[PDB]
Amino acid sequence: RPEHFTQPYLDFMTHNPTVFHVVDYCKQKLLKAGYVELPARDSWTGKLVPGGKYFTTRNGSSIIAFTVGQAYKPGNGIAMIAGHIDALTARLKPTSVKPTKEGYVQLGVAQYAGALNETWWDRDLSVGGRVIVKDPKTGKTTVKLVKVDWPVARIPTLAPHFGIGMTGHGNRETEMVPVIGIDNSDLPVGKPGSFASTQPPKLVKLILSQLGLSDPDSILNWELELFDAQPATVGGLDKEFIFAGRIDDKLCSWAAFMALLHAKRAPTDGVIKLVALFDDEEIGSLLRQGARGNFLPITIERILESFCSSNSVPFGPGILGQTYARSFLVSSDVTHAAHPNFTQTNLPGHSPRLNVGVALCVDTTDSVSMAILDRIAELSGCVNQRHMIGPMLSAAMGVKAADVGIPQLSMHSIRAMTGSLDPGLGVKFYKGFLDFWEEVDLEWS
Amino acid sequence: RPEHFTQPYLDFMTHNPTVFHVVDYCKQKLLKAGYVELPARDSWTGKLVPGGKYFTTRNGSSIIAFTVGQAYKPGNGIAMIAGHIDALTARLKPTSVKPTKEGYVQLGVAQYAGALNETWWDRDLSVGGRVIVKDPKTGKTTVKLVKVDWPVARIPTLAPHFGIGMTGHGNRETEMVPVIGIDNSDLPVGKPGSFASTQPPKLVKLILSQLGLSDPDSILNWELELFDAQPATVGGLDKEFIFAGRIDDKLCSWAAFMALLHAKRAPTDGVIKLVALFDDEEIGSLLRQGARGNFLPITIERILESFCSSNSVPFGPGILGQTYARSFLVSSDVTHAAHPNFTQTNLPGHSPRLNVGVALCVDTTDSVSMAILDRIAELSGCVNQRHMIGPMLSAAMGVKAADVGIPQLSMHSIRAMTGSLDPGLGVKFYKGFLDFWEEVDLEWS
Amino acid sequence: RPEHFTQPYLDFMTHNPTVFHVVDYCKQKLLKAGYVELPARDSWTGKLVPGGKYFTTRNGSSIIAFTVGQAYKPGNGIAMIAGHIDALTARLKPTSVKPTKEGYVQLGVAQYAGALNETWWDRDLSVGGRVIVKDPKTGKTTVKLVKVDWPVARIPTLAPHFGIGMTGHGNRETEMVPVIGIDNSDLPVGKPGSFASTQPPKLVKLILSQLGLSDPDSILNWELELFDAQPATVGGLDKEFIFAGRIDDKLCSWAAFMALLHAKRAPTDGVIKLVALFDDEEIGSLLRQGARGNFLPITIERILESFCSSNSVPFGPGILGQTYARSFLVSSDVTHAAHPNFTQTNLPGHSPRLNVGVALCVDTTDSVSMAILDRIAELSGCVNQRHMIGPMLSAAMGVKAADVGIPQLSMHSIRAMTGSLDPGLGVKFYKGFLDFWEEVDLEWS
Ligand SMILES: [Zn+2]
Ligand SMILES: [Zn+2]
Ligand SMILES: [Zn+2]
Ligand SMILES: [Zn+2]
Ligand SMILES: [Zn+2]
Ligand SMILES: [Zn+2]
C-alpha cells in the first residue's frame, strides 16, 4: 500500500502551489468524505456527537479536522498530529509594479521566509494565490483562488564571463528582481487610486480573465506568490525518488491528513482523532493561524465544552486537562535524510534513509515518547528511524508529545527530494498512531 | 538555624544527580510530611479542603506542591515560588554504542544544555537516569530509577606536548567522546533489532543488575546522563564554602522546597502557599514540563475551580484574576556572586557576597516588588542583596513578581561553589515570603 | 599478580601528595624491609657488605636505594632504574598573604612547572608540604610533614554569561588566584617581622595545630603546595581505569620502587640492584637533587670505593667504568597511550595500549637496548610495547641505557588516567630487569 500514495501525492504537490490551495484541497476531500464544517462565529455546543466528523478553518490557510470516537465521553484523550502547510515562497509586494528597465517588464516581490536562495535562479516561475474580489451581484466582499498555468516569471543569472559570479553578491532586492515580460517600445489599468493601478497591467488583465471579471475595480486586493512551475515527479534509475518543491512540511501535513481520512472508526474507539495543519511556521508560528496561536487550544476547548453540555457535565479546568493528560501530540516537520556528499553533517546511527520510514527527531521527543511511538510502529508494521544534528503546542496544552519527521534532502530548496515511498510510509505511521494511541496508553501506568 | 541546612543540602546534591531523582526526592519527603498527591487524570473538584496539603507531578521531572490555608476562600491570593531542577548535563544518544577505537570502548553522548565546556574534561563521570521497563508480571509499561555508584566514564585531555592544547579545538562530537572501558582483543545483548542492541553491552548488563532484571528485552528505552561522581562537600580554611556540581538552580529549588516544608500553617492563614519546580529552563522553558508551559496555570485553575464547587461559587475569569491580583510570584534562579579575579565583571553595589543572603536580581523585579521583599526580609530577620550585570509565569498569569537568587560562583561549571550558609539563608528568606506575604499585602493600597 | 598492586598504588597516590611525602613513604617501607640508611656526612668505607641493603637521601626529596648481591665483587655491574617523583604543582609564594578582595580571602601561589593549566580550574584543592620548625626542647632546626585533610583552596571559573570564556585569558597571575575563605567584615599572627606574618593567619594556625605547636614564631619557614584533594580511584565499566593526579612519574617511580622491594636476592647474584628517585625533572633536573646532578654518580663511586677498602683493591677510574661497562640504566618516565579522540597524534605501530605492559620509548633507546629489554621481557613473561612521537645519567656515567615508560593519557593534567593493571605490569617488568640483567649480559659478547 505505500506505493499507492505516490501519484496522489504527486498530483497534490503539482496542483496546489499555495497554502490557500492546500486548505481548499483538504476542505473538498473532507466534505466528500462526509465531514461537517464548524464555523467559528456559530455556536457548536449543541451539535457535536459521537461518531461525528468535523473540521474548522481560519483565514482559509489553517485547518483542523477531527473524528470523535463512538465510545467518546468528556475526559477522554485526544490523539492529535500537528504540521505546517506554508512553504518558503516569494510574495508580490503591495505595489508589485516596476519601471520597465532595458526593455524588460519586472515584478516587485519580497522573500517571505528567506526563500530566495541560490536555488531560485533560472527557474520557471508561475504565480498563484487568492484575490479579494467584490462580487458583481451581491456587493459582498469575497475571496477567490487563482493560478496561472504557464511560467510568467523568472530570475535570470548573469553570465560568468563578466567576472562576477552568476548569482552576483546575492542581494535579493537589487539583483533578484523577477522578469515577467518584454517592452521595447522606447525604440494604466483602473481609476488612478485603485489597487489595480499598483500592479503590472498584464498581471491584472490575466488575473481578471481567470476569474471571469472585466472591471479592474472589482479587485480590492490579492495575495499572490511565485512558485516553481515544474511538476512534481518521480526520478532515479528505478524511480525511487520524488522530485518536488515545497516539500518542507506539505509532505508531512499531506501524510497526516491522509492518515485521518484512512483512520479507523471502531465502535470501541473512545478518543478523538485530530489533525491540525497550521500556517506560518517558518516565521515562528505565532500569528492568528500559527501554531503558537490560540487556534488548536480554543478549538479543543470548544469541542469539550460542547460535549459537556450534551452530557450535563460542568466544563472547566480539569475536565480539560484530564483530557490533556490522556492525550498525545505528534508534531511533524520534515527531517534531514543522510546526505551522501556532506558526510560531515551525518551523525552516525542518527541519519535517516529514504524509503524506510519516519524518523523520530531527538535533541520534545524523550524516552517515554519514544517508547510509545516505537510500540505503535510495531503494531502498525512500521520501522522508526532516528534523526539528530511548532513543536510547542505541547507546552500550551501540557500534552505529552514527540517530534516526528519524514526524511528529506535539500530542505528549503525551491526543489527538494524524498523517496517515492516516503509519503505512503508516512501515511502508514500516522494512521498507526491515531488508531493505536488509546490502546497503547492503557499499556502504561 | 541556617547552618542546620548545610549537611542536608550536601546529602541532597550528592545522592540525587538527575532531574528524575530530584522529583523522587521531593515526592518522598512530601509524602512523609502528609501531602496528598493529585493525579492529573483524576477529578479534583471534590477533594480540596482548607488546611490540606497536596502535590502534582508531570513526566516525573516536574512537581508543584502547595498548602491551603485554613482561612482560605475562593478569591484569596497565592504566595508562590518557581524554580528549575534541570541542570547542564550530557545525555546518552539514542544509539550510545560506538566502535572500539585504539582499544578503548567509548560512549555516544549529546550535550543537553550546551553543557560540555572546558570544566568537563578529566572528571570522574558516573551515569544515571530513568529506565522504561516492561514488568514481566503485569505486562504494563513502567519507569524505574537507576544510578551507578562508581565512575564509569571519562573525557580525557590530550597532553600539552603535542602542540595542540589539552582541550584541542574543543569540538564536542569528535574530541569529547567519553571513554567507558578497555578492549584489547584485537591483539551483543538482545534480539538484533531491540533497544538493548543500540547500547554498550556492558552498560546494559550493569543497568539490568541494578534493577534486578535478567532479559535484555525487558528494557524498552532509558533516559541516562553523565554527571560528576565527586560528592558535594564543604571547603575552605573555615569550611565556609560548598563545592558541588549542578548548582544552577538545584540550590534555589531545594531551598524553596524546604521553605514550603518548614512554613507555618497558622489557623489565620488565608492564602495558598505554593512551590513549583520545573524542568528544562536551560532550554528556554517551554515544553510540557517547562515554565512557560501549561503546568502551573492549569493546576492553579483546577485548585480554584475545586474550591468553587465546594462553596457553590461560579468558576470563571475574574474569580481567577481576583486570585491573581492578590498573589505574588518569586521566580528564583541562582545569581552571580562577586568574582574576586574578574573584577571587570563586578558592578559595584550590585555584586552580592557569599553567606549574607538572597540577592534581588534587577535589569521582572521593580520598585514595588523590591519594596515588598525588602519588607518581608525585615520581618524574617534577613538582609537582601542586589544583583545586576522561568521569570515569565508572571506574564502568563499577570501576577506581581520578582526575580530572586542565591549568589554563586562558576555558574554552569560541572562543579560550582557557594557559601556553606547560603542554602540555609535561602530557606530562611523563602519561608519568610510564604509566611509573611499575606500580612504584607494588607499593608498596601 | 599485577592486580595485587592496584589498591596499594591507589593508597600510595591518595596519601602522599608531595615529593616530601613520597620520600617519607619510601623511607619507612625500606626501613621495615631491613634497609640501612647511609648518611652523607658519615664515612661508608667500612660498612658495606655483600647481601646488604641500603638507601640514601638528599633534601628529603630524593632517594637512592640498592641491594648488594651476595656474589658481588668490585668491578661487577649495576642494574639501575631512574625516575622522578616531583609532579606539576602550585607552590605557595614566600609571601602567600593577599588582600581580602570582594569578601574573599585569597592565597599567593606560583606555578612550579607551567602547572596551572585548564584542568586546574574548579578543583577541590588541599595543601601540604614540609614545615621548618624551631624545636622548643632542643633548640635544633628540624623539618616536619604537614597535610590538611579537607579542601582549603579553589580556583573558580567565571560564568560563560559574561562574554569572556570561563577561563578568561588564562593569565595565571591575576585570574588564577586561589580562594581560601570568606571575610565580609567590611559590611595578624606572629611578631610583625616573623615568617608567620607573611602568611594567611588561619593557614598558620591550622598548620600549627597539626604539628601540635602553640607559638607562631616556632615556624621559621615552610614549603607548601596545592594538590587535588580527590582520591585516586578505579573507574570504567569494569574498573579497568585508574583515575589519579600526579601520575607523571609517581607511577613509574612507585613501580620501580616496589620492584626493588620484590626483587630476588639469590646467593649467586653478582650485581648491585639500584633504584634512584629524583626531584625536579619538570625543571630540567639540574640542581642538587636533580638527575643531572652528582647525586647518583657520587653515591655509586662511594659504594664502589667502600668495597675496594674491604677487599684491599685500589679505587680509581677503570675500576669504576669496568663497573659502568657492565651496567645498564633503565630511565623510566611515563609515555603517551594511544588517544582515542586525537588520532592525528597516534603514530601507528608505536602508540601503546592500557593494561598490556611497559612501552619502550624511541626517538637513548636503540637496537642494542631494545634487544636486551625484549629479552628480559621474555624471561619475565612480559609484553613490551613501542612508543614514538632525565635519561641522561647515561651520558654522565657512560652506562648503556633505555627510556621505558608506562603508558598514560592526559599527561600533566591535574587528574590523569592509566589502566588498573598498569602499575602492576610495571613492577613486573622492572623486577624482571633487576633480576635478569646479569644473566642477559652474559648472553652477549
Ligand atoms: Zn523549514
Ligand atoms: Zn518545516
Ligand atoms: Zn543554568
Ligand atoms: Zn538557572
Ligand atoms: Zn612531566
Ligand atoms: Zn615525567
Looking at C230, C261, C284, which one is the last position of a domain? C230
Scan residues 306-345 of B and list those with Cβ closer than 8 Å to C.
336, 338-343, 345
Ligand 2 centroid to A245 CA: how many Å? Answer: 13
Check B102 against C355: CB less than 8 A apart: no
Nearest partner of C84 among C66, C67, C64, C68, judged by Cα: C64
Which of B237, B342, B386, B410 to probe by mutation at the C interface, max C CB count within 10 Å? B237
Please, which chains are in contact with C (at least 3 CB pairs closer than 8 A)? B
How close does chain B come to C147, measured CA to CA in Å? 13
C438: left (phi over 0), alpha (psi -120 to 50) or beta: alpha
Check C340 against B102: CB less than 8 A apart: yes
d(CA A106, CA C57): 94
Scan residues 384-443 of A and list those with Cβ closer than 8 Å to B.
386, 388, 391-392, 394-401, 443
Looking at C202, C230, C258, which one is the last position of a domain? C230
- Let me know whether B237 and B162 are in one domain: no
d(CA B131, CA B143): 6
| CATH, residue A74 | 3.40.630.10
Check C119 against B124: CB less than 8 A apart: no
Resolution (A): 2.8
* SS3 (DSSP) at C435: helix
CB C410 within 8 A of CB B166: yes
C-alpha cell at C71: 656474589
The upper half-sphere exposure of residue C180, i.e. CA atoms within 13 Å in the direction of its Cβ, equals 25
- Let me know whether C222 and C240 are in one domain: no
How close does chain B come to A393, measured CA to CA in Å? 8
Q: What is the DSSP string of A48-107?
A: --TT-EEEEEETTTEEEEEEE-TT--TT--EEEEEEE-----EEEEEEEE---BTTEEEE
d(CA A399, CA A369): 11
Question: What is the distance of C-alpha A202 from the center of its chain?
Answer: 30
Burial of B314 (0-12, 13-18, 19+ CB in 10 A): exposed
d(CA C77, CA C403): 19
Greatest Cα-to-Cα distance within chain A, rounded to the nearest angstrom: 82
d(CA B256, CA A408): 47
Which of B6, B10, B92, B102 to probe by mutation at the C interface, max C CB count within 10 Å? B102
Ligand 2 centroid to A428 CA: how many Å? Answer: 20
- Let me know whether A225 and A244 are in one domain: no
| CATH, residue B171 | 2.30.250.10
Question: Does C contact B via 3+ CB–CB distances below 8 Å?
Answer: yes
Which residues of B contribute to the annotated binding site for Zn(2+)? 84, 248-249, 281-282, 333, 412
Residues 6+ apart with CB under 8 A from B347: B388, B389
Angle between helices A247-261 and A19-32 (to 10 degrees): 10
CB C243 within 8 A of CB B228: no
Number of domains chain C is built from: 2
Strand partners, C146: C129
CB A178 within 8 A of CB A89: no
Question: Rounded to the nearest 10 degrees, how much is the dihedral formed by the CA atoms of B15, B17, B23, B25?
Answer: 0
DSSP A235: E
Nearest partner of C157 among B408, B13, B6, B10, judged by Cα: B408
Residue A135 belongs to what H/E stretch? none
A312: left (phi over 0), alpha (psi -120 to 50) or beta: left
- Let me know whether A205 and A151 are in one domain: yes
- Ligand closest to C252 (CA) is 6
Check A392 against B95: CB less than 8 A apart: no
Q: Report the first-to-last Cα separation within chain C, whole angstroms.
A: 34
d(CA A224, CA A213): 17
- Let me know whether C357 and C415 are in one domain: yes
Ligand 3 centroid to B420 CA: how many Å? Answer: 20
CB B123 within 8 A of CB B230: yes
Q: Does C14 touch chain B (CB under 8 A)?
A: no
Residue of A nearest to B297 (CA): A317
- Let me know whether A70 and A126 are in one domain: no
- Let me know whether B186 and B221 are in one domain: yes
How close does chain C come to B86, measured CA to CA in Å? 17
Q: Helix count (H) and strand count (E) of chain A?
A: 9, 20
Looking at B230, B254, B280, which one is the last position of a domain? B230
Overall size of chain B counted in residues: 445
C236: left (phi over 0), alpha (psi -120 to 50) or beta: left
Strand partners, B79: B273, B328
CB C283 within 8 A of CB C113: yes
d(CA C46, CA B421): 65
d(CA B279, CA B277): 7
Residue that has been written with the C-alpha cell 488509546 in this structure:
A438
Check B233 against C124: CB less than 8 A apart: yes
Nearest partner of A434 among A251, A265, A297, A249, judged by Cα: A265
Cβ atoms within 10 A of the Cβ of A97, count? 19
CB B155 within 8 A of CB B179: yes
Q: Helix count (H) and strand count (E) of chain C?
A: 9, 20
d(CA C272, CA B421): 60
Find chain A residues with C-beta within 8 A of B63's C-beta. Answer: none
C-alpha distances in Å from residue A34, one per residue of A26, A80, A264, B399: 12, 20, 15, 46
DSSP B120: G
C-alpha distances in Å from residue B196, one per residue of A147, A402, B132, B190, C278: 53, 21, 12, 6, 51
Please, which chains are in contact with A (at least 3 CB pairs closer than 8 A)? B
C-alpha distances in Å from residue B327, one per residue of B271, B303, B382, B418, B442: 9, 14, 22, 31, 12
Residue that has been written with the C-alpha cell 527527531 in this structure:
A361
- Let me know whether A372 and A406 are in one domain: yes
d(CA A348, CA A333): 21
Residues 6+ apart with CB under 8 A from C283: C112, C113, C290
Residue of C nearest to B173 (CA): C341
Angle between helices A6-15 and A19-32 (to 10 degrees): 130
Ligand 2 centroid to A256 CA: how many Å? Answer: 14
DSSP C349: T
- Let me know whether C34 and C138 are in one domain: no
Scan residues 124-143 of B and list those with Cβ closer than 8 Å to A.
130, 132, 138-143
CB A150 within 8 A of CB A128: no
Q: What is the DSSP string of B327-377?
A: -EEEEE--EEPPPSS-GGG--TTS-PPSSS-PEEE-----HHHHHHHHHHH
Nearest partner of C187 among C68, C102, C292, C81, judged by Cα: C102
Residue of B nearest to C412 (CA): B159
Q: Does B122 touch chain A (CB under 8 A)?
A: no
The upper half-sphere exposure of residue C30, i.e. CA atoms within 13 Å in the direction of its Cβ, equals 27
d(CA C258, CA B27): 53
Residues 6+ apart with CB under 8 A from A192: none
C-alpha cell at C387: 612508543
Check B41 against A322: CB less than 8 A apart: yes
C-alpha cell at C246: 600526579
- Let me know whether A340 and A365 are in one domain: yes
d(CA A399, CA B375): 40
- Domain range for residue B284? 1-87+231-445
- Let me know whether C24 and C111 are in one domain: no
- Let me know whether A197 and A290 are in one domain: no
